[PDB]
Each structure stands twice: as C-alpha cells, then as structure tokens.
Amino acid sequence: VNSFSGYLKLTDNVYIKNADIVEEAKKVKPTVVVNAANVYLKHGGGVAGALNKATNNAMQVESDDYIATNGPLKVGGSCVLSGHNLAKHCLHVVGPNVNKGEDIQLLKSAYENFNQHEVLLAPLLSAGIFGADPIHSLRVCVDTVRTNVYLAVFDKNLYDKLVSSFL
Numbered sequence: 381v382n383s384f385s386g387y388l389k390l391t392d393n394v395y396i397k398n399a400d401i402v403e404e405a406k407k408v409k410p411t412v413v414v415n416a417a418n419v420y421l422k423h424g425g426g427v428a429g430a431l432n433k434a435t436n437n438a439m440q441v442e443s444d445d446y447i448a449t450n451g452p453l454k455v456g457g458s459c460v461l462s463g464h465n466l467a468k469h470c471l472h473v474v475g476p477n478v479n480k481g482e483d484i485q486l487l488k489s490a491y492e493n494f495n496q497h498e499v500l501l502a503p504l505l506s507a508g509i510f511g512a513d514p515i516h517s518l519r520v521c522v523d524t525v526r527t528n529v530y531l532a533v534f535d536k537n538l539y540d541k542l543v544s545s546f547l
C-alpha cells in the first residue's frame with residue numbers, strides 16, 4: 381500500500397492520473413520523482429522547468445555542479461540527484477527529443493531506467509515539448525517498465541485520450 385490516490389490502473393504495474401506532477405510530488409513526497417531532463421540538465425521549460433521552479437532553482441544549481449563534474453548525460457540515460465522539497469530523489473531521465481532529430485527507439489532505453497526503482501512518480505517520457513506521440517510513450521512505458529509507476533498527465537484532454545485509446 382502506498383499514498384498515491386485517484387489513479388486509474390492500466391496494468392499490473394502502471395497507473396495514470398490527470399495531474400500536475402509538481403502538485404502531485406508536493407502532496408505525496410514520493411521516494412522518486414522522474415524529471416523529463418535533457419543531456420545538459422538545463423531545466424528551462426516543460427516538466428523540467430516546472431519542477432525546477434518549484435525547487436526555487438535549487439535543482440538547477442545542483443544540476444550545474446553535476447554537469448561540471450561528470451559531463452552531459454546520454455540520450456536514453458539518467459542520473460539520480462536530490463528531490464529537494466518534492467521527493468527524496470529525482471531521477472533525471474533523458475528521452476529522445478523529436479524536435480532535435482533523436483532516435484525514437486531510444487525511448488525504450490529511457491524507460492528502462494525506471495526499473496532501477498521500485499516505485500516512481502513520472503511524466504510520459506518524450507511527450508510535450510519533446511515532440512513524441514504521448515500514446516506511443518504510454519505504450520513503451522507499459523511494455524518496458526516492470527516496477528510500479530504512477531504517471532501524471534498534465535493535460536486533461538490528453539489524459540482522456542490516453543485512457544480511451546489504451547489497449
């Protein structure tokens with residue numbers, strides 16, 4: 381039993397809700413919140429910009445030190461950093477950005493990072509400003525993630541389409 385509330389169950393291990401991941405994280409304080417990161421951990425917009433804003437830019441400060449030490453992530457890769465006031469940890473995961481020409485096959489590799497964590501609050505990878513089809517992102521999630529994932533979908537219209545079209 382966990383604290384996540386109001387989710388629709390899609391499969392044994394995947395759950396979905398129309399919610400602002402920022403507000404959801406502040407309420408649940410999950411062990412892991414997933415950020416829709418880029419390789420430079422520049423949290424300018426989309427989910428990343430919103431999460432970072434909610435940390436009063438502390439996420440960005442921590443991320444800049446991480447990059448200065450380690451260099452950029454790989455597309456499809458991840459790193460674990462602090463969750464600040466939102467969660468114990470933030471798993472920064474880089475899905476491919478279609479608006480940069482990146483291989484959509486890397487979306488499966490991106491979701492594989494979730495399997496290193498028993499329970500996660502997460503957005504749909506590569507959705508939104510990353511330009512991929514969110515219906516496809518959900519399919520890859522369900523077919524790749526084996527740990528317990530609670531998906532927050534900000535847009536109500538998109539949430540209803542995701543549910544109504546789910547196989």
Ligand SMILES: O=C(O)C[C@H](NC(=O)c1ncnc2[nH]cnc12)c1ccc(Br)cc1
Binds near residue numbers: 399400430504509
């Ligand atoms: O809707 C989505 O979940 C995907 C993307 N948004 C985000 O990734 C996002 N951004 C900020 N806070 C969030 N909390 C949870 N997801 C959040 C998006 C896609 C299509 C349309 Br249309 C409008 C937005």
